[PDB]
From Swiss-Prot, chain A:
This is Vimentin. The modification Phosphoserine is found at residues 26, 29. One of the most prominent phosphoproteins in various cells of mesenchymal origin. Phosphorylation is enhanced during cell division, at which time vimentin filaments are significantly reorganized. Phosphorylation by PKN1 inhibits the formation of filaments. Phosphorylated by STK33. Phosphorylated on tyrosine residues by SRMS. O-glycosylated during cytokinesis at sites identical or close to phosphorylation sites, this interferes with the phosphorylation status. The central alpha-helical coiled-coil IF rod domain mediates elementary homodimerization. It comes from Homo sapiens. The chain holds residues 384 to 415 of 466 of the full protein. Homomer assembled from elementary dimers. Identified in complexes that contain VIM, EZR, AHNAK, BFSP1, BFSP2, ANK2, PLEC, PRX and spectrin. Interacts with BCAS3. Interacts with LGSN. Interacts with SYNM. Interacts (via rod region) with PLEC (via CH 1 domain). Interacts with PLEC isoform 1C. Interacts with STK33. Interacts with LARP6. Interacts with RAB8B. Interacts with TOR1A; the interaction associates TOR1A with the cytoskeleton. Interacts with TOR1AIP1. Interacts with DIAPH1. Interacts with EPPK1; interaction is dependent of higher-order structure of intermediate filament. It is linked to Cataract 30, multiple types: An opacification of the crystalline lens of the eye that frequently results in visual impairment or blindness. Opacities vary in morphology, are often confined to a portion of the lens, and may be static or progressive. In general, the more posteriorly located and dense an opacity, the greater the impact on visual function.
Length: 32, 51
């Protein structure tokens, strides 16, 4: 359970790495 | 890509009214009023009509 608190923090960091990848490729993909 | 906002303009197709063909009809009514054969007036009415 105490290891799973750290694993769920890495799973929130993966759910955040998704939003960072989503944000950075959106800076690369661009207007008129 | 909502382009055609540029559209490298449209400084335009320019069917503008900058015409004189549209002709500059120089109706020169040279009214030579003579008395006895001597010119007394030349009323040269230039109607300078742009059609």
């Amino acid at each position: 359970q105490d290891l799973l608190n750290v694993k769920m923090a890495l799973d929130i960091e993966i759910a955040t790495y998704r939003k960072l990848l989503e944000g950075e490729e959106s800076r690369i993909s661009l207007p008129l | 890509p909502n382009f055609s906002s540029l559209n490298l303009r449209e400084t335009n197709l320019d069917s503008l009214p900058l015409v004189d063909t549209h002709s500059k009809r120089t109706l020169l009514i040279k009214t030579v009023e003579t008395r006895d054969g001597q010119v007394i007036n030349e009323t040269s009415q230039h109607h300078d009509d742009l059609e």
